[PDB]
Symmetry: D3
Subunit: 309 residues, 6 copies
């Protein structure tokens, strides 16, 4: 899917950039934002064409509140702000954001350059509220030391899971994406043995093999994020998580970013993680990870994004 | 297609693992085997996701007999055990195999790791009967020194040639695969001149150009493996041949592996090779290569495989 | 795509070869040529399969006069010879060509070797009339110093821009290609400031960013090559331009090659460049670039090419 | 070199990490720090060996005050704290730093992971006072758009420029390094024409060609940073500058890091830049760049570091 | 060092071939062997030059006994057959070998081809006794899942550790190499917890960090293989260990290969491993790994090798 | 040897550029040429630094006649114009050239860009008389289809063979290089069988193995270019040959370029090839290859090159 905005199905990359911005309250601000995001193919190619491989991609997401400013009476079926959750000890806050740019490439300079051009074009019309420079960490691992992304659906399965279909024809090809910037307590996580960490996750650490059923805890990250409806049909999401961090401020992080054709799936996963199934049987990754943001965005298909205003 | 099992249409790779196994007669065995293969996506991703490029692939083949132990009520139009051939000079054996794992990656370690995890999860339920570690040799050559795989169908031609279509709709997306582990007589091949070797194969050696029509022997490997029907229509297979060997055992091999939507095509090629066309006019490649195995498998589509 | 002839939508490559040829007068010449181009998949795979990555591609174009010698039976709707243009300052000549081979690969040797096999196979039946060895120059730049190709359509847009569809169903999958070999006056170009060069092209030089609507001159290259119909729909072409040159001859060039499902789009860009829009307001790029060739070809789909 | 600490002469990399730290007051803090830096080869290999290519490097610098806490016994001839400069328009501050870790690799994860291990191992004994994640920007450019590093000495010239020799034999193989973290005023920079920017730097922008002697302004960055002794001998430094920034903070930076066997060379460049040569005639780069840090370190050879 | 035999100091590679041969008792044999190895540069270049990067290398080892058949009047200070070890629980055999070919490249095909040409040129004059195809496993790990080779000496440390110096001047540039083909008990190793495995090795598993001094078992592989003399001086070897295996035979191996300027260092390591220090306190790696071979060779400098 | 002019010992590359120029007769011309070549490190780094790998190299050679214009009374011991040879059917002509630029890199654009900058700086002061764009052809082969360069010395052996030592201390580190642009008769060469081609060369075609002694013809390319003096000491040269060609003008070529500390070795090789040993027993490669140029150049060390004028 070379140099085309809204390519949700892109495979993992060595570098990413996650930018979340809040749009200004004016009509000028709205119009500038609308010009930039609807012409996003411009800077995408301005930057990406310079690398022969064409690895650069950019997915634009729009928040529920800003969507209603730019497209009042045409609205994807499930667009709403992020639903915050409050467990006894761990919570998923809902944090501001009208615009998401999820940028991936084989190199840092390409992500940075595109972000620079996007930010420059928006000028005073929007403000960056969250910025994360993701990087691949060894053999596709996160900073907890586990391979992160293994069971992502691919090919047809990825399209089926991520992309709006016949349920909502006016927005076919779009998606819904949720982000959360997690920070880890590395000290506390290191007090665990490998075997305990594997029980927390649901897979072996080095070898990345799923624990067998008889050894798989009911509150493992894997068990809690396995979604099968009443009819026995599995429901998956597409994740593009990346490590990030700052050694001086002791930030070791995982940027969660998951796409679904219906955010009810992602939301159910989150509520299973934070609230438990059975109730109180929550995801122990959360003992070692604290979400600092939580925002949902609608990802319009190319055709819809280009029509805005 | 990234990290999806039963991806028959994958381009050539630097490394291969060909694993042929036989299943236990037991019923725990039938079940374990069934669990490992119907969930093969699991180990594929467990290993393959660790490589940024996601080059790892795995095609699972099921022998006719073991297919009957596991899906009795439904069977693909052309599933049967490998038809042995007994020709004038040369013979193709029919050797045992219930399960085929055709593994490819950019790296050896990925092939080995995936194999290791497949074998470990099968435990005592099945036994490795043939293991081949294939490798790319220079510019896509076999150990006979010819570029090997040149005329393979690609893209749409490849799908049409290898993948079960409207003609057997319950098994669309599947394929039939035949393997044969060939061992070469390197001394004997080396006593031929380049030009004689070219006559045997059907193409120039260094340049990999197909001989002119007037200079093309009627028993050249290329002529014998060219299939045209009565309407004038060509029928092709998709080969993923790799070299392999052991210097201490003086083994120098080409691992043959061919996919077709209908094994009749591959079987006819084998027939023209081993029996000759006209009869006795056989493939001289056979004078320097001996098939140590010979096994046919059904390659179920990913949907069919995941039900079991 | 992989090693398939007529792959119009291939992404940019490190190297390419542009070969333009005129065919001989005899019916023999016309048969040899038809034989070569209709079997072009042979040499394509013979060379291309030798590279693991399979980057080698080859698009064959056929000029209008030659097409009539071979298929007076049926014609693509827009096939005609290249139309010369005579502007107030610059002219685009129409120069001979019956056949185009547009060859791309990750490596020069692959392009060269494919060209070698093609030319050898054609022998006396054809003569090379123009030959250009294109190369990538830094971060996708032309020798004028500007990123060249930025706004090419990609993916579905590329197919909708370049590939013949419902409008001419007999030749669906084909395309039309125009080539022009441009030589630059480098010393003249360098007398301009970067800002002046930016106003000539329509984008900033290092950063490759389109000039704002109100800083875009009406005769900028970008402005003149923007084609918008009465219904507000933009019409794009697919360009595969490469740098070339010779330091001893002081030749510094850009080889233009542009594919479109309807060549009138490309032709209209050419007219607006050479004659200006409004008339007189011509493309200042032409003050530093002189086209030495100008030829139109029909690019038959694989099916149509293989039946010629 | 391969996975050896204090490899000053490594070529440029895709990624780097600049960590500046202040050590604690206690003798315990001074012992932990000495333990970590003297054993720095451990973490270097622990991380670095994991990459086949072995690109990971780590140069440890020690500030003058900290060096006295650890080796009041003997001092390198030119070790002193960074000298602040107060020019007519711009100033270079002297900011704290006892330790520098200058880490380079082909990959960000390697730099990050080495930094992680270093910081963890130091625990409470030290505090990170400045941290910069450098990255390569297109074809070796800084964020000002100019190729940055062109005239670095290489090979023998690099060793003669950067490495302590006969002049201070007790510390042979060591070096002296100055870091300054510069932030740019990008909107101001963009108001200049390319030609104006070229006159500020001393080279053409896209093509990276030194301006002719008679078009080179006397206050160009290149002119001011050319150091020629009375005997006509040029004295060069070794720079490993990288881009960095944060789009949300509008931070666009160049991290300066310059190695020399005698830091007076580097210091003299700094004085000529900030104060001008002649006085008043200062470097116009400083009109668009503000140094937020300024620190001098001694870079001990492996031997000396390993005995600390 | 490119395409030069006896390049002991080469960095790790993606692929290896370890070939151990015994020579014929005959005198034609002595001579043929002598011709093949003294001219080993020939085949090395014949194969290696075909790869642009020139990654192929070949170290030739000569057993003590065969060295006496071929260079009677001159012998290196420490050449002798491999000293077998018979410990409390575990034993290291002394297996036969006259010739060692330690081959490394970026690719398998280059290793195999070189091996093929070496074996072919030796003909009946010598017989392959052990053949191992080594491969890189993930991020420089052995099949026990630990990063393997981390603490290897590099650059000058590596030359000082592995290469014969002023202390045996007739053989400067040479080395002594010991091989041992280890096979692992994967089931048994898998019943240990990660933490127990870490205690056995001496380093953390995923992170490859060396255990703290207070947590470092006295029988950990690292402790046992740490050699410090009476003056306080450490002595190291250069290891080029690779993984290898066969899934059907359930073989999972680490091929040990260690180079030293003096085999006493390596022999002491082996002694501390197998016998323990204090006695009985042996290396628990040995509880999960069994040495199937054990052979010592002299690695002549390229000058010494080419005279024979 | 990163981005340093006169790096004679560089390993093979994917692309090369061979430029031969004749200097103008004036004093201005001489001075401009002298400025350009003595400052050659300038454009070398201006171009080469832009590629992270630093693969770009440039070796400057100076002809005997031009050397005497720029360095009248300091002269390397063996600098003379190319010695032409005249066999009964094949000849090695001596053709003009005062300057050689032998440029190598991993990419074409880098070779071309450096050549452009060099040519631009020389302006009217010199004229290109020969220009060849070399490329790697498959697995290090020439257009005859044989691996070409196999037995080149490497490392210490390469330094010993190519570079002036104690014999001529004032020019230590310099070298002497000879070029000849060969064109092949591809038709005639294809009428030979592989086995005959192997006898012409002295090695097997595909596998690149030296023919054994008992099968190695006395007029094979290998035999004729094997140089052993009376004392039994072998003398080698360092070659950087590359393919080149033009399909339209039916040019299929090999650019010969060989470096030696003493051109007597290269010259002896050439006379063995063209004249035979025994006499008339000439190199049969020459039945299929015709030299269109022949020029010798002195390659000054960096220090000597930078001192010129
Ligand atoms: C601290 C943040 C997180 C970390 C470190 C983390 C880590 C992991 C790891 C190591 C795996 C196993 C390999 C795989 O990707 O298949 C995994 C699986 C998964 N995680 Fe997360 N995760 C995080 C947050 C989340 C969140 C917030 C969600 C849901 C909204 C989520 C959903 C999933 C899903 C759906 C899977 C695949 C489960 C399966 O079907 O096997 N993760 N995660
Ligand atoms: C010792 C084992 C074999 C070797 C060494 C070998 C080698 C080759 C070579 C060098 C080529 C020409 C390049 C190419 O187009 O791929 C070729 C072509 C081919 N081979 Fe084989 N082959 C072997 C076994 C087989 C077998 C057992 C079959 C059939 C079951 C087969 C079917 C084909 C086909 C269909 C072609 C393409 C023919 C065309 O249309 O030109 N091969 N083989
Ligand atoms: C089954 C065979 C072996 C395995 C799996 C193995 C594994 C390892 C591992 C995982 C390490 C730590 C990483 C490193 O520094 O390389 C190591 C270190 C080392 N091994 Fe082995 N090893 C084996 C056999 C041997 C033998 C036979 C010797 C001696 C003859 C040896 C000598 C060493 C040495 C000297 C070190 C570095 C110690 C230090 O200074 O930290 N190893 N080995
Ligand atoms: C048409 C031009 C030429 C072609 C096609 C050619 C080709 C070859 C080939 C294929 C080889 C074998 C592999 C190797 O490089 O070691 C070779 C070797 C060699 N050639 Fe050439 N060559 C040409 C011109 C020359 C000239 C003019 C000279 C001497 C001035 C020369 C000197 C050598 C040398 C010294 C060797 C290595 C011989 C040895 O010690 O084994 N070549 N050449």
């Amino acid at each position: 899917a070379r140099l085309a905005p809204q390519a949700v199905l892109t495979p993992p990359s060595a570098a990413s950039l996650f930018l979340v911005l809040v749009a200004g309250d004016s009509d000028d601000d709205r119009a500038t934002v609308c010009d930039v995001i609807s012409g996003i193919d411009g800077p995408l190619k301005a930057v990406g064409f310079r690398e022969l491989a064409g690895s650069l991609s950019c997915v634009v997401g729009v928040g529920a509140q800003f969507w209603d400013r730019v497209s009042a009476s045409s609205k994807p079926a499930h667009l709403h702000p992020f639903v915050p959750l409050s467990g006894p000890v761990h919570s998923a806050p809902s944090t501001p954001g009208d615009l998401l740019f999820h940028i991936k490439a084989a190199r840092k300079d390409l992500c940075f350059e595109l972000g620079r051009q996007i930010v420059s074009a928006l000028g005073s019309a929007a403000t960056v509220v969250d910025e994360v420079h993701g990087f691949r960490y060894f053999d596709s691992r996160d900073l907890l030391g586990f391979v992160d992304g293994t069971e992502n659906p691919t090919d047809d399965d990825a399209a089926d899971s991520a992309l709006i279909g016949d349920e909502d024809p006016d927005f076919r090809g779009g998606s819904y994406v949720i982000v959360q910037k997690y920070l880890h307590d590395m000290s506390a996580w290191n007090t665990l043995s490998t075997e305990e960490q594997e029980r927390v996750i649901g897979r072996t650490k080095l070898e990345n093999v799923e624990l067998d059923d008889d050894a798989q805890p009911s509150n493992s990250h894997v068990t809690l994020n396995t979604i099968v409806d009443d009819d026995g049909v599995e429901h998956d999401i597409l994740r593009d998580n990346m490590a990030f961090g700052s050694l001086g401020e002791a930030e070791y992080g995982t940027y969660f970013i998951g796409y679904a054709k219906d955010p009810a799936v992602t939301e159910l996963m989150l509520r299973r993680m934070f609230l438990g199934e059975p109730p109180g049987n929550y995801d122990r990754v959360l003992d070692f990870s604290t979400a600092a943001t939580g925002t949902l965005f609608f990802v319009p298909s190319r055709d819809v994004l280009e029509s805005l205003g």
